[PDB]
Design a protein around this ligand. Sequence first.
Ligand SMILES: *C[C@@](C)(O)[C@](*)(O)[C@H](Cc1ccccc1)NC(=O)[C@H](Cc1ccc(OC)cc1)NC(=O)[C@H](C)NC(=O)CN1CCOCC1
Ligand SMILES: *C[C@@](C)(O)[C@](*)(O)[C@H](Cc1ccccc1)NC(=O)[C@H](Cc1ccc(OC)cc1)NC(=O)[C@H](C)NC(=O)CN1CCOCC1
Ligand SMILES: [Cl-]
Ligand SMILES: [Mg+2]
Ligand SMILES: [Mg+2]
Ligand SMILES: [Mg+2]
Ligand SMILES: [Mg+2]
Lengths: 204, 244, 231, 226, 241, 250, 243, 196
Amino acid sequence: SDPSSINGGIVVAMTGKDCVAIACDLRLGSQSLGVSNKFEKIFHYGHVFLGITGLATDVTTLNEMFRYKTNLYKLKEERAIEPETFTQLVSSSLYERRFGPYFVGPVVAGINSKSGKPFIAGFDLIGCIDEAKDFIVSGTASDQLFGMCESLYEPNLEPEDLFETISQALLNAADRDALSGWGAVVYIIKKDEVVKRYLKMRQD
Amino acid sequence: GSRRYDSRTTIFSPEGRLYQVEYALESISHAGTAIGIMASDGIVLAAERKVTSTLLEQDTSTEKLYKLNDKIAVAVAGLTADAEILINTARIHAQNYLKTYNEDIPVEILVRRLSDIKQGYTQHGGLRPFGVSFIYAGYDDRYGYQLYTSNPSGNYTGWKAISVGANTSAAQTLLQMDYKDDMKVDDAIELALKTLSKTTDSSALTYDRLEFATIRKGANDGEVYQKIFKPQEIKDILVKTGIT
Amino acid sequence: NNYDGDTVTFSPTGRLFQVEYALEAIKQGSVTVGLRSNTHAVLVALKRNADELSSYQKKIIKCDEHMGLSLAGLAPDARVLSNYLRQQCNYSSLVFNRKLAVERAGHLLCDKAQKNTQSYGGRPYGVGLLIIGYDKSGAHLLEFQPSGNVTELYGTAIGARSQGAKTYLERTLDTFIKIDGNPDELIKAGVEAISQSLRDESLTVDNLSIAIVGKDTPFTIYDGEAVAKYI
Amino acid sequence: TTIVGVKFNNGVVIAADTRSTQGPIVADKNCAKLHRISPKIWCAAAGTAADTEAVTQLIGSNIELHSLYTSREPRVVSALQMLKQHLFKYQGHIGAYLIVAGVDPTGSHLFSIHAHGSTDVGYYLSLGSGSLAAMAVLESHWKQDLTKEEAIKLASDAIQAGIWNDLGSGSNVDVCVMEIGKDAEYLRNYLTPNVREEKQKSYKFPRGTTAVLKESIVNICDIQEE
Amino acid sequence: GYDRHITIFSPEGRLYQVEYAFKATNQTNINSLAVRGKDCTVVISQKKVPDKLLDPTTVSYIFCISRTIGMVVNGPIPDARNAALRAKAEAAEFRYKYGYDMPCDVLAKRMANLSQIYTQRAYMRPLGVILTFVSVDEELGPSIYKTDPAGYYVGYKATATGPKQQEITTNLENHFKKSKIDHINEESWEKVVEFAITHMIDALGTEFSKNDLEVGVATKDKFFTLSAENIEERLVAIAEQ
Amino acid sequence: MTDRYSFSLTTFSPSGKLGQIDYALTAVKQGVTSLGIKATNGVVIATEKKSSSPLAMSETLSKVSLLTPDIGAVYSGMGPDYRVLVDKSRKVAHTSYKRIYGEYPPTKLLVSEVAKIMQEATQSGGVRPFGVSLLIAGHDEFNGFSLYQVDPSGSYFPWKATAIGKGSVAAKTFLEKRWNDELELEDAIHIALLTLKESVEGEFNGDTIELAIIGDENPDLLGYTGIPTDKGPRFRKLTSQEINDRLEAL
Amino acid sequence: TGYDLSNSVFSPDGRNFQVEYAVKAVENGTTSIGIKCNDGVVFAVEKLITSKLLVPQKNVKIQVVDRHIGCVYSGLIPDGRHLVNRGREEAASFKKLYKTPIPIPAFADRLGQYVQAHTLYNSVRPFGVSTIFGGVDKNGAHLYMLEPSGSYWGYKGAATGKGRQSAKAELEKLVDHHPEGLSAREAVKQAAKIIYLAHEDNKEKDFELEISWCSLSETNGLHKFVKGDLLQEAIDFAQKEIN
Amino acid sequence: TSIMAVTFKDGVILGADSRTTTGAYIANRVTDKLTRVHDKIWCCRSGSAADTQAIADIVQYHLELYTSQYGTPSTETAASVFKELCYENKDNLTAGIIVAGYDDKNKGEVYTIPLGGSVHKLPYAIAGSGSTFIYGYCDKNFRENMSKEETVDFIKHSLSQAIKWDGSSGGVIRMVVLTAAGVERLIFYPDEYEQL
Ligand SMILES: *C[C@@](C)(O)[C@](*)(O)[C@H](Cc1ccccc1)NC(=O)[C@H](Cc1ccc(OC)cc1)NC(=O)[C@H](C)NC(=O)CN1CCOCC1
Ligand SMILES: *C[C@@](C)(O)[C@](*)(O)[C@H](Cc1ccccc1)NC(=O)[C@H](Cc1ccc(OC)cc1)NC(=O)[C@H](C)NC(=O)CN1CCOCC1
Ligand SMILES: [Cl-]
Ligand SMILES: [Mg+2]
Ligand SMILES: [Mg+2]
Ligand SMILES: [Mg+2]
Ligand SMILES: [Mg+2]
């Protein structure tokens, strides 16, 4: 009935020193039934990363929509869209469905390729931007993620430390939520390399 | 009423031709020549610019060669503004297909839709046709490398090598002479430039009058790359073949 | 000449040639006559055939129990205008419980014909009509021309050679107007009026069409052996 | 939210707190609720966050185009008229509650506008969940013929009442001052009375603490040459 | 030559229907003149009532568009009234949407844009009129803006329109060359009206009775026209100096 | 009362010409000279204020127009057509770009949109082409400075320097000699003023010349302080006084 | 040339020839007049008796709009009817929104703008009538005449159709010889005279007179037809003055 | 709200309280509920603040356009335009409006337009939540052809009582006087009107 908690899922993003991290769980269910163990919630359009939680049909639809829009952007502008610009595009696109919204919690992460500045942003389902210096959380275990992030986080972490911090935030939040977990992925993003790691986590 | 001023853009002549299409083709025949050549390992697109002034900013200029998606390019002969309307339509059709099927659009399917739009302006609506001919260069995993052309009639056909715009008679004779099926990209590049060099109405063919592009499966590890040649890259490729 | 391509063009003398050409289709039409007393109104129409194997085209159309018309010119245009009259009479009944005045009927036809004389794409109606009826102010005869001009008359005629019948009625005026409480005498007078427009042909049993309406008489159409009486 | 507007001698000042909430959770601790409509017309926003951002951006866009069309500097009453007609049309469903202020060729102005499309004029105003805490301060300390310095003080005091006493409001105070004859000065984080204390401990983990199943390099680049 | 019937280009890059609309402008054979004071903007126009059967109070080419804006038209009256109704609607709509009175120049731009559309779109003919808008704008002060069938418009220090416009124009040009200022340095609108009538008399070479003129005055927060009798009071003062 | 002109008024003739576009270009030839020159750290665009009456206040007619804070346009040809194009270009910059991406469009893309509008007037039913050529000068973060010409057809071309209207052949030749890729903005302004004197008959001062630049960010023109990343419009219209100062060293 | 083949085209003079051709249709029509009096207006018209067969008193040409406005016209009769129908829609929408009946100057511009709109496009033809109309409102009596161009003015008296010149000369004499004013009952009689005098120019066929009036005193500001004894009194007056 | 309009010898006077409520909270205590739709045609507003504003803005627009085309509108005409909006949109509006104006011909007039969008021409009218408490008082104390000072006192005493008993009314008493002399705005503070 409540569309934001039929399928389950979480996304968290964090900034470190000259890097960002974005992570998600892998579960897709229909309420109590876990259906898929491979449902990733993080996508990329060039060097800009988008995590989407919420109703899974809208997660898929929005990914396809932003792939469409960023492909056209790139053809017309002759360059890749930057995270600050993509954040505005997400907001515009969500707000144009104001009275029949996509039931989603998007999260943008990336490094501005010109200025080198790490960037993360979060949104509500109708496009209000939350541009945070520290972290962004989204999904069914958002309360749990807020608690983990607010205690575990410290500024200017190095990529390999940030990885431990974001992974522990995700793993422990997921374990206190019935509809999140079943696997996790963590992207560590620096200006010109991106490492992706699948975490070992409890499978219940 | 208004009937008095209607030129009637979508009628047959007594001979069974479409006046406006024929007259649009006449317009296209005075445009800068564009050549497409298909090899076994890639495609060449080469086009001659019509507006030379020493003061034209050439490195930020694009009148002839446009990217439709990552696998498909077009070369333009005719009205540039007309062509940009159609190009943006084709870019949108490509992305609709990708959205729908999660697969890049097959080249013929894109070509057919653009050609169907052109056809519509010849059969209904009372508007003038688009004064544009396209050479489509692209790759997909069904037919590999493909070259097509379309013109204001909305008729399209596929080719091993083809020219559009000015002096296509001369250009097609020369391509027919030196083209062979086993040919490679590097040879096709040389063929394209030689053919332009002989058909041009200018005294000499120089880097500042050209736009040039390739589509090779000559990328790192079995994928396809579009290279729109920068001015310096055309200048080098003009020396490497001994036209300068 | 240069000014007759459509209805939306005045000539330099202020004429509308497409309307004048529509008027011309009426003059090619078979003759029809209308006349009235204070108690009844009568339509007589000469029906025309294609050849001897054919029917004689029907010229008279009922619009309501108290109103109907005769046509000369394009028959399908009479069918369009008569359908509009049927609807307007019908609207007056259902909404106001009121039989539509013959004067209002004429005004409605005028305005409907006029719109086709001022706008591009359309054409004028190519038909003239004689409308008769009995309403709250007695018996009425109307002449409709597709210019939009509608005229109330004691009697008239339209179609080919209609000037004969029209002169007869112009003379007879003081006689037939007096034919009150006597349907068969009013019909006779109309049949003699129409006879002044005949040449070579004369009025046979399947050639003649008569209609009458009045005080305690619904609009009824007489065809075939029901007009033998009047030949 | 706590937002306020205070009129002074040569202008108007608006202020806001910086908390946004999602249920009882604080979604953002440092939002910007002071929205620029035009260079000298600013408004403070309360209500549905996305609606306030969208409504000010739309009206700001149309005000810019109107300013270009007329070759005139935009007026506050035009921003107000466009906001009221837009919000009224949506019958309260666009939940923006705004304090609209600025300077223009006509002078200095201060208005409030509700989600259903009603507007008010005042020398001092407050909106949002903390509007009662703020209005208590404004009703106790406001006087006519205020200086710029006195008005900034009063406005930020009124926000502070909201910050401390209303659970809907917190973190920092933002101010924008619009004075006649001068550029508008936007004072982002004018007050910062809620810095988080030093944590007792660092939670930085030993590298290798987290169990990994697989790694890989992600290709972000375009399709390569040669 | 169907390029002469509708608003498409001729081979020499011209719009003949626009040029012929300019000629309709003078069909009435009336001259108009506008000037600016310190506090005011005055507009005067010849009034000709040829037929004795006309009600002369209904014969006018000056229009009150809004409280602050007046408009005088040079052209046939049906096109003038079309322009006047549109400008009234536009000025009222502007006030409703944007919460302040439409400035003279913005209305002038708006009506000029509408006129431009008739020069570009084939189904609409140009209006055969020139529209002189006057006001005392709250930002810009005394203002005169003039629109024509090409969609052209500009502000003026002073202006004149009609068959004898060039005579009036040079008369006014010559005054401002002497005075070396943009306006009539005069406190009262009454004296600015007197200036306007005086300089039209000189330029046209004709004297005027009270019924030969039509006068409009814009002050701060109203535009109004003068009665025949306020004009007689004006004509008297000119004669006595 | 209906628009029945749903057919093209611009069509191909037997020779392949689009007559109405050619005739539009002829109207552009009759128009007053305007020009643009690209420098390394700026762009200048300039034209003559040919006043119609000397009673006209030529200050009120702006031939050089701001489209966005970093983009400006000037024209040659029919002024009313230019004025409505400026209105539409300003609007399309918001509707098709700023309201989507939260930032002003890059020059080439705004040019692309204006070009589109002009192409539609060349093919749609019941309209004539626009009788203007535009020069659009602008700056954006990833392309730097640029200068584009837009013609009645909808075609646009990027230029290092160019001129359009009346004396454009002579002015283009004058610019071929003086232009180099090391020009500083002041040198480009000086060349613009020299080139424009050739095409002007009468008075030649800051009241008869309209000139604007795309240069450095002007924080004093922004209207507000307090946002570090908002540094101000790069578009600036030179005043009468500023032009006259540069005419004394000429 | 060809400038006269299409409505809304300017000739090189600055004229719309199709409107000028519509005027010829008006000039071809029967004479109609209006006379403004002290507290009212009078309208009169010549109805040609084509035939004995026309029912007398039964082809009424003058038309009421709302309850206070009379309209008469010369030219294409159906075009005049179309214009009155529109006039009626305009008067109804005014009264619907503002409550008060439409003022005569307001009504005059409604017709004016509508007639003028039929000179703006080649898809329509101009009106082939000139229309004389007026009545009493809160500000007094008003008489108007409206031509195919959409041009209208206020009048002391007005005339149009074939006998317009004769009638115009007659109206000019009334204005000169009655400067302090004319009563409503004088004007009815004078209207009869003028139509009879103007009939000289249409003298082949005999004619039927039709008169109407609105007067603050005589009709309480409503439009009524002149019938019976008062019509005959006016006819007698007219017959006496031609002989 | 408490609003009234009262005709008298020289014209008409409009009066109102200044309280705007948001439940039990007073959103604005110095509200101006008397709004000008034409130079000498004014209205009192009660019901939804948004609805009555939207209506009054439209009426102001309609009457400014009336003025341009047809001259000064009557008070009846202004009331007709309010009525049309209130009647046709009766499902979506909560507006109780009193319209008052001065002509030289008709002198002072008062029209009241309650919830359903009916119109009622009256010598005086009262409306708003607070008006219930003064029906008795106003009926007993109103006479026709009062002086300006008498009418000011009648309204001051009436709204005084409405304010005293109605929690949804309060603040200052504003009045607008409409005569041939022009337009006079009056204000009366609690310390004057409470002790009456
Ligand atoms: C004190 C407070 C927090 O209420 C103040 O008004 C905030 C103002 C503000 C303005 C601009 C930017 C950021 C913040 N408002 C919020 O923080 C709102 C509070 C709110 C929640 C829910 C509703 O529901 C009718 C109204 C106001 N918070 C939000 O809008 C958050 C970000 N989004 C949501 O809660 C999800 N929305 C709620 C409304 O319905 C659509 C989904
Ligand atoms: C007696 C009183 C004070 O209520 C009087 O009628 C006021 C008239 C007034 C106020 C301000 C300006 C002009 C005239 N009315 C109000 O104060 C109204 C009361 C009211 C609210 C809602 C409805 O809804 C049918 C009727 C009357 N106050 C408001 O409108 C305030 C500003 N807005 C709200 O309370 C929000 N409403 C709440 C109910 O749902 C719609 C939105
Ligand atoms: Cl516009
Ligand atoms: Mg779990
Ligand atoms: Mg489990
Ligand atoms: Mg046109
Ligand atoms: Mg109380």
